[PDB]
């Protein structure tokens, strides 16, 4: 979550080049998530200017995806080094947003929420609300285990899954066996005849 300028809303995307995208918040190309934003000119704007919102426009390297940088170090603009003192060719790397209600829409504060869903296979902690059904064994069923959809026959098995292992895979990465998320038991998946 962050609040940016209305001109910077388009920069929150994979493969985007810009001041905020390269120096403040960088998105990976294989981004699996959602980007949500809305206008908040009535909230985050003083009558004389809400200068409490800061952004970085000076950095000598582009950010790597999902990087958090709170460096206060003064940018060495010229050839002469800056030993912690700003001035000529030595600039404070952050800039204050001037949030006035009389500004245009492109220069209005926008409350941006970025959702990112790591889909790495591990015991899962965040699901959606779905009425769970009783499992039926030794029958061709259309199963759904934590969003993994498939058709097959669920039978009792003896494949000792390790406690951190949730899914089993075949040679052609078809789901060979699953651990039930409700009761910690082991089942094969054999596709129907």
């Amino acid at each position: 979550s962050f609040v940016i300028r209305g001109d910077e809303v388009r920069q929150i995307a994979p493969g985007q080049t810009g001041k905020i995208a390269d120096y403040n918040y960088k998105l990976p190309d294989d981004f699996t998530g959602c980007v949500i934003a809305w206008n908040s000119n009535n909230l985050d704007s003083k009558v004389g200017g809400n200068y409490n919102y800061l952004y970085r426009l000076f950095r000598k390297s582009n950010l790597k995806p999902f990087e958090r940088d709170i460096s206060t170090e003064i940018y060495q603009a010229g050839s002469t080094p800056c030993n912690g003192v700003e001035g000529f060719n030595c600039y404070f790397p952050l800039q204050s947003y001037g949030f006035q209600p009389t500004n245009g829409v492109g220069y209005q504060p926008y409350r941006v929420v970025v959702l990112s869903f790591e889909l790495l296979h591990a015991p899962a902690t965040v699901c959606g609300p779905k009425k769970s059904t009783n499992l039926v064994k030794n029958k061709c069923v259309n199963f759904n285990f934590n969003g993994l959809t498939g058709t097959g026959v669920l039978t009792e098995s003896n494949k000792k899954f390790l406690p951190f292992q949730q899914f089993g895979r075949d040679i052609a990465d078809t789901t060979d066996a699953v651990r039930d998320p409700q009761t910690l038991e082991i089942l094969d998946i054999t596709p129907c005849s």
Binding site: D170, I171, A172, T174, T190, P191
Partner: peptide
């Protein structure tokens, strides 16, 4: 395996191949 990849059995079984070789050898 289970991705639609099946093996069809031969028309002539190994017993019939043995019978053919036996007939040829005896002849």
């Amino acid at each position: 395996k289970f991705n639609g990849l099946t093996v069809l059995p031969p028309l002539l079984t190994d017993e019939m191949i043995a019978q053919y070789t036996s007939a040829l050898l005896a002849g």
